[PDB]
Amino acid sequence: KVFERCELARTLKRLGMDGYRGISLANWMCLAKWESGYNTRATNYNAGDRSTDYGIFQINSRYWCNDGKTPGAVNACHLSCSALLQDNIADAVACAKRVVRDPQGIRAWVAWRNRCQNRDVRQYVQGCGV
Numbered sequence: 001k002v003f004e005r006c007e008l009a010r011t012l013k014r015l016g017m018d019g020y021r022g023i024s025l026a027n028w029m030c031l032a033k034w035e036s037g038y039n040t041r042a043t044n045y046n047a048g049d050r051s052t053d054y055g056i057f058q059i060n061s062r063y064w065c066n067d068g069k070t071p072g073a074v075n076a077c078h079l080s081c082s083a084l085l086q087d088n089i090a091d092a093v094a095c096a097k098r099v100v101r102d103p104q105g106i107r108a109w110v111a112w113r114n115r116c117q118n119r120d121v122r123q124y125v126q127g128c129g130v
């Protein structure tokens with residue numbers, strides 16, 4: 001599914017993402033916008049290293065989920081990458097929380113560094129009631 005902006009903001013809030021490990025909801029929204037356009041079924045194959053990015057946060061198979069076809073990969077979220085393609089984003093959120101329990105935090109997604117870091121991200125949650 002493709003979420004509408006404020007629908008996603010409230011969904012993420014109910015799932016406990018506002019301020020998780022210090023990360024504001026607006027940062028999570030900025031991440032989802034630029035990774036996938038709020039699209040839970042999005043996939044991106046990385047021919048360079050044979051990994052694939054999955055779902056609304058475009059979480060990568062080399063480290064975070066298992067798809068069986070990524071060489072020398074691990075599965076730190078202990079999920080099938082299929083779980084990151086559901087309309088219900090609970091599992092994707094659990095995995096995103098696992099990602100940011102590691103040292104880099106939200107910087108684990110390079111797109112966040114390029115599109116959200118040191119930026120005014122307040123627009124992504126304006127009007128959503130969060």
Ligand SMILES: CC(=O)N[C@@H]1[C@@H](O)[C@H](O)[C@@H](CO)O[C@@H]1O
Nearest residue numbers: 046058059060099108109110111
């Ligand atoms: C949290 C996460 O999935 N990070 C991955 C990152 O580790 C990877 O090296 C990069 C390359 O496509 O894609 C994503 O940013």
